[PDB]
Amino acid sequence: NKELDPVQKLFVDKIREYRTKRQTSGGPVDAGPEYQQDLDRELFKLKQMYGKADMNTFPNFTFEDPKFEVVEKPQS
Secondary structure, eight states: OOOOOTHHHHHHHHHHHHHHHEEEEEOOOOOOOOOOOOOHHHHHHHHHHHHHHHHHSSSSOSSSSGGTTTOOOOOO
């Protein structure tokens, strides 16, 4: 495997589907027409956490799913 197996690709195409929604028209970074470099850097951070987390925290990379509904109330 060079740098993308027959599946990992779907991942990069998943973080660009959940972050894309957050974009809308007002978020982090200038968010210009090619801010993708700021969106990939954020999603790229996951691959780093998954490398040590072993996907033990995320049942299937959610970051939006309702599964988060566990303790919604505290400021945090």
